[PDB]
């Protein structure tokens, strides 16, 4: 596959995908750091809804793509997202969801033609 064919296959799939953007910050940050991440998350929500034409879901368990406020390895064991992630990793036959950090999501969206 070429990058052009890769982009078209993603776009066709994104029309049939539900995306969840989580509330939980994995670690202690300042008010300034949290505001910077939140502003980036809000821009990503708009790109997925308006440009990629995905459905925004409020339930991370009813989503194909999960956008995180950090890396999955950074979330505590007691965290609901971390528990669900661990439960999915153990089941080979389970329905697969992607867990993307907000940095990985920014790079993906830029590779789709929406540079942010």
């Amino acid at each position: 596959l070429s990058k052009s064919s890769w982009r078209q296959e993603w776009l066709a799939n994104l029309k049939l995908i539900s995306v969840s953007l989580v509330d939980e910050f994995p670690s202690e940050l300042s008010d300034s750091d949290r505001q910077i991440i939140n502003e980036k998350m809000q821009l990503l929500k708009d790109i997925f809804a308006n440009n990629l034409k995905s459905a925004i879901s409020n339930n991370f368990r009813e989503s194909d793509i999960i956008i995180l406020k950090g890396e999955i390895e950074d979330y505590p064991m007691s965290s609901e997202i971390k528990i669900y992630y661990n439960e999915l990793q153990n089941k080979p036959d389970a329905k697969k969801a992607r867990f993307w950090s907000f940095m990985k999501t920014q790079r993906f969206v830029s590779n789709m033609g929406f540079d942010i």
């Binding site: 990058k3 890769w6 982009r7 296959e9 697969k96």
Partner: peptide
């Protein structure tokens, strides 16, 4: 969603 499509381009 299927695991075959990569997040990173070819």
């Amino acid at each position: 969603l299927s695991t075959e499509l990569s997040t990173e381009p070819p």
